[PDB]
Structures are given as structure tokens and as C-alpha cells.
Amino acid sequence: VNPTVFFDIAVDGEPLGRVSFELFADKVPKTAENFRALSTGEKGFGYKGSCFHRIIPGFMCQGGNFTHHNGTGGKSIYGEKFEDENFILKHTGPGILSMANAGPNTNGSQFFICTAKTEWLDGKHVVFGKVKEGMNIVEAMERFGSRNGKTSKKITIADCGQL
């Protein structure tokens, strides 16, 4: 059974509301599990307090970075990086949850929430979940972005976990 997770989103420290995601563990269990564990924080680190640092209206919201010892960009629960598990799932429309990377097999913690169909990224980014409720929150976040990705207010994950 696919796990559900939630982010409680804030804008300049003010809670806006909740977004929940279905994680497609039935298709990419390793990638889903990394995201789940970083959402609950059960390994001692994860998305809580993290921020959406690059938001491009019409495209997507990217976050999941946090500082760690011995490098940069985030770490996964399996190490500094892990393999592209598979590319079964495509970027089919708004709400899609998919992994940011720095090329092949460099998955960590960073991810993005699509606000459009992003077909050009199929085969290069592992899709692994989808917004379940609170797309209105993601649409509200999206307005705080810009063409170059800079946000006009600070968008954070005030809290997160599993439902």
C-alpha cells in the first residue's frame, strides 16, 4: 500500500496550509522510501525546516536541500547519493513529484513538485509521487516564484510527516 505524506507549508514563517502526497512505492520503492523517511525525520534529519528555494511559475517548485556534514545539496537515507531506480513513471501533469539531480545517479534529497506537464524531463528524472490534496497550496506557492526561480517570500516546510 502506497504511503501518504504531508508538508505543512509556511510563507515568511506564517502557516498557509497542508499538502499531501501519494508516494508510488509500488513502482519506485527505494525512491519513495527515501522521501517518506526524510518527511518523518526518523533518521535524525530530513525536510522539516527546509525551504522551496527555486520556484518557476508555469514549471515547478523545487526544494529539499539542507546542510549536512561532508558535502552539499542534501543527502538521502542510503548515503550522499543513490541510483536512478527506474524511469517507468512519466511527468504527466501538475502535482507530479520527481527527483532533482546533477545528472545520472545523483539522487539525494532534492525534489520538485510540477505545476505543468514537463515531458522534456522524462527519462532523466525519477518520478515517484503525486500531490493528493492541497494543490491549491502548491498553486499559492507558485505565485511567489519568478522566471529565474527566486522567490519573493520565503517558502518553508514548517512541518512534515506521514499520514
Binding site: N65, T72, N101, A102, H125
Partner: peptide, 11 residues
């Protein structure tokens, strides 16, 4: 362009 990378962000 429209990419989602982690470090060397391209156009």
C-alpha cells in the same frame, strides 16, 4: 531553459 538540477543550474 527549464531544468531541475542540484548545483550547476542551466538555462
Amino acid at each position: 531553459x527549464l531544468l531541475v538540477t542540484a548545483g550547476l543550474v542551466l538555462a
